[PDB]
């Protein structure tokens, strides 16, 4: 409850994210001028749907690994038992990756950084999931409008994992104390930087929750599955 303890928690989380961000934000915004050509896009469209589900799955798997390298660098998440740890990632791991996607999204041209270059949503037409593709560009566009900073995404994605409202938690009371200590540090950082406005413009939890459930439902059929 100490001010020093709260600030030390903000600093800790912001660094655990700076070390497991997969890509440097200084480079994601520097690559936006590198858009796919009309020929390179046609290559991604003629590809078989199995070829695309296999590529994207390697991307999501790799991304979910960083979200784990990030979760481990939290002095408080490791204090949870083997079971509670698995619960929070199994439910939250993918949701955090979906939040981190707003970084690689270009709100101007409505493109996303996919494999070295930025490309529109018609680049993934081979999947046949015309509707699912939109829910990502939509969810990412709303977050890219807020101008999410690295520390805000780090603090936000941290509150998506540590959530005492996850089913099957053994040390549920211990998760609440951790969730509060993060919710408190999240408010404190928005005051230091005068960012109280974004609190009422974030995606209502459950939307991010239901959105993720819709993608796994489609994802499982082609590639499996849980995953670790
Ligand atoms: C059924 C699908 N959903 S999905 O299977 O569950 C799925 C699969 C992969 C990713 C991730 S994570 C991630 C990352 O952080 N770093 C890696 C980079 C890209 C920087 O090289 N990249 C990606 C990615 O390649 N794509 C492909 C284009 C999409 F438009 C956005 C996501 C995610 Cl977010 C999801 Cl949702 C879908 F997309 F069809 F709906």
Class of domain 1-228: mainly alpha
Alpha-carbon distance 125 to 36, whole Å? 15
How far apart are the CA of 59 and the centre of ligand 1, in A? 6
Alpha-carbon distance 132 to 129, whole Å? 5
- Alpha carbon distances (Å) from 38 to 43, 44, 117, 137: 9, 10, 13, 20
Helix ranges restricted to H, the chain: 3-18, 25-28, 38-46, 49-72, 82-100, 130-145, 150-161, 172-192, 207-222
**Mutation probe of ligand 1 site: the residue of 136, 138, 221 with most atoms within 8 A of C-beta:** 136
Compute the CA torsion angle 85, 88, 91, 92 (nearest 10 deg).
-120
What are the extents of the domains in the chain? Answer: 1-228
């Amino acid at each position: 409850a100490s001010l020093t303890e709260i600030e030390h928690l903000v600093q800790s989380v912001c660094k655990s994210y700076r070390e497991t961000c997969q890509l440097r934000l200084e480079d994601l915004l520097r690559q936006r001028s590198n858009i796919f050509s009309r020929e390179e896009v046609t290559g991604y469209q003629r590809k078989s749907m199995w070829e695309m589900w296999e590529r994207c799955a390697h991307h999501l798997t790799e991304a979910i690994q960083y979200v784990v390298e990030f979760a481990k660098r939290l002095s408080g998440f490791m204090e949870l038992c083997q079971n509670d740890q698995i619960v929070l990632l199994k439910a939250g791991a993918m949701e955090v990756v979906l939040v981190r996607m707003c970084r690689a999204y270009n709100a101007d041209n409505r493109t996303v950084f996919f494999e070295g270059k930025y490309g529109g949503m018609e680049l993934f037409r081979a999947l046949g999931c015309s509707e699912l593709i939109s829910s990502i560009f939509d969810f990412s566009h709303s977050l890219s409008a807020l101008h999410f900073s690295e520390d805000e995404i780090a603090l936000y994605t941290a509150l998506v994992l540590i959530n005492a409202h996850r089913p099957g938690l053994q040390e549920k009371r211990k998760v609440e104390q951790l969730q509060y200590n993060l919710e408190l540090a999240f408010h404190h950082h928005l005051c230091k930087t005068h960012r109280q406005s974004i609190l009422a413009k974030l995606p209502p939890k459950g939307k991010l929750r239901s959105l993720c459930s819709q993608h796994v439902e489609r994802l499982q059929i082609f590639q499996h599955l849980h995953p670790i």
